[PDB]
Design a protein around this ligand. Structure first.
Ligand SMILES: Cc1cc2nc3c(=O)[nH]c(=O)nc-3n(C[C@H](O)[C@H](O)[C@H](O)COP(=O)(O)OP(=O)(O)OC[C@H]3O[C@@H](n4cnc5c(N)ncnc54)[C@H](O)[C@@H]3O)c2cc1C
Ligand SMILES: Cc1cc2nc3c(=O)[nH]c(=O)nc-3n(C[C@H](O)[C@H](O)[C@H](O)COP(=O)(O)OP(=O)(O)OC[C@H]3O[C@@H](n4cnc5c(N)ncnc54)[C@H](O)[C@@H]3O)c2cc1C
Ligand SMILES: Cc1cc2nc3c(=O)[nH]c(=O)nc-3n(C[C@H](O)[C@H](O)[C@H](O)COP(=O)(O)OP(=O)(O)OC[C@H]3O[C@@H](n4cnc5c(N)ncnc54)[C@H](O)[C@@H]3O)c2cc1C
Ligand SMILES: C/C(=C(/S)CCOP(=O)(O)OP(=O)(O)O)N(C=O)Cc1cnc(C)nc1N
Ligand SMILES: C/C(=C(/S)CCOP(=O)(O)OP(=O)(O)O)N(C=O)Cc1cnc(C)nc1N
Ligand SMILES: CCOC(=O)c1ccccc1S(=O)(=O)NC(=O)Nc1nc(Cl)cc(OC)n1
Ligand SMILES: CCOC(=O)c1ccccc1S(=O)(=O)NC(=O)Nc1nc(Cl)cc(OC)n1
Ligand SMILES: [K+]
Ligand SMILES: [K+]
Ligand SMILES: [Mg+2]
Ligand SMILES: [Mg+2]
Lengths: 597, 597, 217
């Protein structure tokens, strides 16, 4: 009885209890910003030596920083903000975290319980507003339930498909003192036969397959053994591997079995292979609409195989909501993909060779490289070339390399032209696609991994969204490396306007600040590369820097990302790069715009 | 029949119909930012000469710009953004607009109807998320109902208490073409006996009053004749006038009847007067908790008068929700306050003199000025003095002067020390209290009033939130004037930490960029005032500038805003400025922080 | 009234505060409010659906409540079944849409439906779904539903042709080979003239008649 109750927190404020529970959940970093409603918590964590506190310039920054932290570390990112505008400012990061499966634990101050529902000073209905962009939220109503609500939040955030949760903290609750004992369980943090039979059935299906392919995504990264078991499966059964944008780094792209990224802007080889495979092994990926192309025309050969009892789609997925949501799984294997792979692989027949299949695959890889128009004398640097340069030079340091991005063409080129080899090194906003993500994510990732090289490959329009957080990087002691691909345009949107709206560029050219004077004002090192001859040495100075650094690179404008699967088209119905076509496109654009673009 | 149907829109896309309806609603300005889902609308408004388009750097900027535009102009502010993160980025401005009664019409792109509910690319449930921070929202489901939904949005935004609405626009709807005729009514924009009796009763109550006071707020500004009728009432019945923060400018503060601002940081004279009045005439104000002080102790004399049938509270309010929400109205007069004043005033007895009442009031004004510690030799500029300087010099131009603010101490000092004389010249975030509001609001206000002087009185922490929008001011041709009060602290929060948390400054000092190099990078004129001797000439250069200009002023740190009604205290239980107390506070702060602050 | 009766019909509620219904109208109102009330994409889908049916060797009509939401519904259902010589099964809610005395009638399908109807749908190469939503009382185990029609779809010689008015119910339970959006009766008027008349299906109807004989209630 007395063994089941705890009185060790009696006499503490809600704020102090918060502090203690952070410690018990092994929180080493908090991202946040103060305000009137959250002052009792800020008073309790005053000069704490138990975790690092990171102060942004804007709560959106705190949110994206916590996301970057979470994706780099595999731990939940913790956010601490005030009521009202402090809390509504974290909504985009929460929606972002939900779409990309990021464990985010948001604590928001709230007006006193006696003031809730009165349209009080700095009162927002954050529980109502954040409901659709969290896995779960709650408003703590008294200090006695505060430890329990904190436990539940961390548990929900990190289990199933990871995602954001919000915990609302009324000021009178965090200021109040615990006077009663509480269940000791609340003061501490934390294979079905049906699934076993599904695994056996899945193995038998794969053991019949003649053209298998692994389609791997973010879920394989949610276990340290994930990439290891993926490689073990691919080696044993001799299977080519393609990944999503969010799966980049799960498989060593230097391996001959690597088909690179699939999808709208993925490799035409990967896209061809998945459209011709008789068995698709989907490992922690959700068949997003950037990946599948036209859904009714997706994976024709695997559907045929399924109907003929010799193949199909084997879906390893932890969230039942995402099983049979987009495409029918021939076998659904529910639970953690890594754990289920341990049971799967020993049932899978070892295969030495697949001559006809790998002959096709090798032929496809050869005819479908990421081709583009190279520099010519006097031309600007091509964005594709810049990415290759950064990738090549970065690999030569004896440090881990982590990449974050903004959203747009630069993001796709980063995905295509880097060589991905390590897990949790691509940190990018994929589901929601939030411009401005790049810089604060890099800061969060850098705090999680102080010895890593962290590179933010950013667009000029994206960078403009959140560039005030440069000051935050300095104050946090985070030596991030920001590379702005300055094409002086919202390139991804102008690409669509070029292609579908006859070169009518409607409000897609924002004016840029002087990025070198900007960096100087922020106390950050600045480097500007303006021509081909400065590329190599400029990138080296960038990577050699031991302080926060902003590199601006002037790059070619009005260049499309290719290959491209246009909306409505089958995954293997792609547009490929062609030199003559690009030249004609340039002439057309010039004529139509009176030579303006 | 054919007279009631319209076919003039047949053949147009949803995007083109949007364009036409903007014209019909007399929209002259749109604030927005492009994206994939909203491209059919952006294509339709391409090179439109029918309205000015303003491009921010961040959709939060668009939102606050539209708010500034709306408050300066009295027209709805129109926002046009894309799906997903474009739309979630407008949530803080929407919550802001709701709390402050600002007519905001937000149009957000959405993924095609065929993709909704699939966790699609850049899909957010913005209708669900924005529900609690809009008056009303809707998702348009086909092009035939688009004109009707646009009409409803503008109508709801601008009637009753004005507020934000959101209209969600699926891409396939805006791309689709109208093939059918629609009701011609949808293609065009738009005194009860009970209230009449209430007015008569209210007049009889006022005609008995011996200590009346007018408590006027934002609602009086929602009609051009508002301030005129307020003055007519105050003159005829000889009544002193106090206003809220949001009512500043409704009454000429140079008039002897002016009691200035009431509330937490309002004049102790105004606060004393309302606590002693036997009749309170509340004109378009909602008894917010920043104004009332301790509610149970609010307006004792008016409650007594009500019980004795010789006075009370007469509440002129347009929204039934806000009648009898906080305090009981003796008489509730529902509807537009200006219209109801036209019926009220002729029933009100003219009064020539109130010797005993105005003797008290004049005595109170004399003993309760906005006192503070003046500069001393070698000291930094006092923030209160800076505000007075700007106010005095700005009044000497032959132009309208509009002021926006950030949120914090600078905001309160701006409210106190400017002399307010004209309606719609205070544009400040009061209900939600959003830091970062100042700069984009100024841009919106400047676009609404191209011939006005627009001054953003901003805090350094507030300015950091949204400083990227400096580029937007330049690209928009908006010659705003930004004054950053640089105390190198989140002053309002450090004031509370000084007073209630024993000078424990927990994470309330963010590092600032070099504001002069920042302005230079943004192509904005920069002025820095660092000492008392530069104050006058620096402010003159600031106001004489004919281009966007950023003025940084180094001001005294750790100075409290006074007077102050602390939480829980009655409105007339205020802290006043005292020179000796300030000195002791300084010594205490110095000792406790080891001389750090 | 408009929302209740259009799309898939359904319930609506209108809440009427007492002071509103007691109050008197003092102002004029838009005269429109005082009175009650084929896409190329769908046309192409219909043509494609017809071509699919014209290849079919074991077709079956699966008809439900939606066919009853137009007076001409049952008429056009019968016209289609006669012209292309197709056996007809219905849901519980579709009962009465087709004359069960007709030799083409397979009776009700589903959990407690005719084993003949259930056998027939599991063996059909083309399923014409007319105003029915593939409810879980009807489909049985979903992954094992309509094996022959899925095979036919993959081999480009059949599949599921779904005539449905509510987009929410298209591709909700089973993937439609062709989705024909809108009122099923109206879309049948466009569909039937593109459909090849068939006089006999000896092997198919031999199976069907055998199934009806061995599976009475
Ligand atoms: C401009 C732009 C273009 C894009 N184009 C492409 C493109 O061409 N190709 C591409 O791939 N992406 C592209 N995307 C990104 C795309 O939108 C998606 O974000 C991405 O494809 C999702 O990848 P994912 O399924 O691996 O990750 P997620 O979206 O996170 O899905 C992971 C799945 O695995 C499950 N899971 C999680 N944990 C586990 C576990 N422990 N065990 C089992 N299952 C688990 C999850 O529940 C979920 O169903 C683009 C994005 C942008 C902004
Ligand atoms: C740091 C800080 C300190 C603050 N301290 C103070 C302070 O000391 N003093 C102070 O006053 N404020 C203060 N505030 C601001 C305060 O929070 C409120 O925002 C403000 O008092 C509201 O003023 P209001 O009632 O006039 O405007 P609103 O909040 O807009 O309320 C207007 C009312 O009038 C009604 N109305 C609207 N239109 C009409 C119409 N046509 N006819 C009739 N009625 C209509 C509305 O429905 C509403 O009920 C502070 C804000 C901050 C950020
Ligand atoms: C104890 C019990 C046992 C049951 N067992 C069975 C069983 O064995 N067999 C069986 O069939 N049912 C059974 N049911 C009933 C079953 O649950 C469903 O209610 C029924 O099958 C639904 O039939 P339906 O699809 O035709 O009608 P609905 O549920 O109404 O679906 C009609 C579909 O047609 C669409 N539609 C509507 N109007 C139009 C239009 N104008 N044009 C095009 N489309 C339109 C609708 O949007 C909808 O998708 C049972 C019920 C109970 C209580
Ligand atoms: C406008 C836009 C995009 S991606 C513009 C991208 O601009 P930039 O950073 O210069 O990248 P790029 O030139 O290398 O392509 N959007 C599409 O994704 C819409 C969008 C709009 N707003 C936000 C916050 N996020 C978004 N993704
Ligand atoms: C932190 C804070 C405030 S007001 C800090 C204000 O900083 P600053 O701009 O330098 O003004 P000041 O020094 O003249 O007072 N908050 C209280 O209102 C909390 C807050 C936090 N975040 C947002 C977006 N808005 C807020 N109001
Ligand atoms: C800003 C948070 O405000 C509140 O929490 C709040 C809201 C409504 C009623 C009472 C309070 S309170 O009395 O419990 N707390 C405050 O009012 N705090 C407060 N903090 C700061 Cl830094 C400033 C301020 O008024 C400007 N008020
Ligand atoms: C970004 C908006 O995306 C959508 O609207 C969207 C979402 C899900 C499915 C189909 C579409 S769509 O086919 O109707 N439109 C697009 O996919 N548009 C699109 N626009 C840009 Cl500028 C980029 C892009 O992919 C990167 N996609
Ligand atoms: K690569
Ligand atoms: K004043
Ligand atoms: Mg760009
Ligand atoms: Mg400050």
């Amino acid at each position: 009885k007395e063994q089941l109750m705890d009185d060790s927190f009696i006499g503490l404020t809600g704020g102090e209890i918060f502090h203690e529970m952070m410690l018990r959940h092994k929180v080493d970093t908090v991202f946040g910003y103060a305000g009137g409603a959250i002052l009792p918590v800020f008073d309790a964590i005053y000069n704490s030596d138990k975790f690092k506190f990171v102060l942004p310039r804007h709560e959106q920054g705190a949110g994206h920083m916590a996301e970057g932290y979470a994706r780099a570390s595999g731990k939940p990112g913790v956010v601490l903000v005030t009521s009202g505008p402090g809390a509504t400012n974290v909504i985009t990061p929460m929606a972002d975290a939900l779409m990309d499966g990021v464990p985010l634990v948001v604590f928001s101050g709230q007006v006193p319980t006696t003031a809730i529902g009165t349209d009080a000073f700095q009162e927002a209905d954050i529980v109502g507003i954040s409901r659709s962009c969290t896995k779960w939220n709650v408003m703590v109503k008294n200090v006695a339930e505060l430890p329990r609500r904190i436990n539940e939040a961390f548990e929900i955030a990190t289990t199933g498909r990871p995602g954001p949760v919000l915990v609302d903290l009324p000021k009178d609750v965090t200021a109040s003192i615990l006077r009663e004992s509480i269940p000791i369980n609340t003061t501490l943090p934390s294979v079905s036969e049906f699934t076993s039979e599904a695994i056996k059935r899945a193995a038998n299906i794969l053991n019949k397959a003649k053209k298998p392919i692994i389609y791997a995504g973010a879920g394989i990264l949610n276990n340290e053994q994930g990439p290891k078991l993926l490689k073990e499966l691919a080696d044993k059964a001799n299977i080519p591997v393609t990944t999503t944008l969010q799966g980049l780094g799960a498989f060593d792209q230097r391996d001959p079995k690597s088909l690179d990224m699939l999808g709208m802007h993925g490799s035409a080889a990967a896209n061809t292979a998945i459209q011709n495979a008789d068995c698709i092994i989907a490992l922690g990926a959700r068949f997003d609409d950037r990946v599948t192309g036209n859904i009714s025309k997706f994976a024709p050969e695997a559907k045929l195989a399924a109907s003929e009892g010799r193949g199909g789609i084997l879906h390893f997925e932890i969230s039942p909501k995402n099983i049979n949501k987009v495409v029918e799984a021939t076998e659904a294997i529910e639970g953690d993909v890594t754990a289920n792979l341990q049971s799967f692989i020993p049932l899978v027949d070892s295969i030495e060779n697949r001559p006809e299949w790998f002959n096709k695959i090798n032929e496809w890889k050869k005819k479908y490289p990421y081709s583009y128009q190279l520099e010519t004398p006097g031309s600007l640097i091509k964005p594709q070339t810049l990415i290759k340069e950064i990738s090549d030079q970065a690999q030569t340091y004896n440090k881990e390399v982590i990449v974050t991005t903004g959203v747009g063409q630069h993001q796709m080129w980063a995905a295509q032209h880097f060589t991905w080899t390590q897990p949790r090194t691509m940190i990018t906003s994929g589901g929601l696609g939030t411009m401005g993500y790049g810089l604060p994510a890099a800061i969060g990732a850098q705090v999680a991994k102080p010895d890593a090289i962290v590179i933010d490959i950013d667009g000029d329009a994206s960078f403009n969204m959140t560039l005030t957080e440069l000051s935050s990087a300095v104050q946090a002691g985070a030596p991030i490396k920001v590379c702005v691909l300055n094409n002086e345009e919202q390139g991804m949107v102008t690409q669509w306007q070029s292609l579908f709206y006859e070169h009518r560029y409607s409000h897609t050219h924002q004016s840029n600040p002087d990025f070198m004077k900007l960096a100087e004002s922020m106390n950050v090192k600045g480097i500007r590369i303006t021509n081909q001859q400065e590329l190599k040495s400029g990138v080296k100075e960038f990577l050699d820097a031991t302080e926060p650094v902003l590199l601006e690179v002037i790059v070619e404008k009005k260049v499309p990302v290719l290959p491209m699967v246009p909306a409505g088209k089958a995954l293997d119905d792609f547009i490929l790069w062609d030199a003559e076509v690009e030249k004609q496109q340039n002439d057309l654009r010039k004529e139509r715009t009176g030579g303006k673009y």
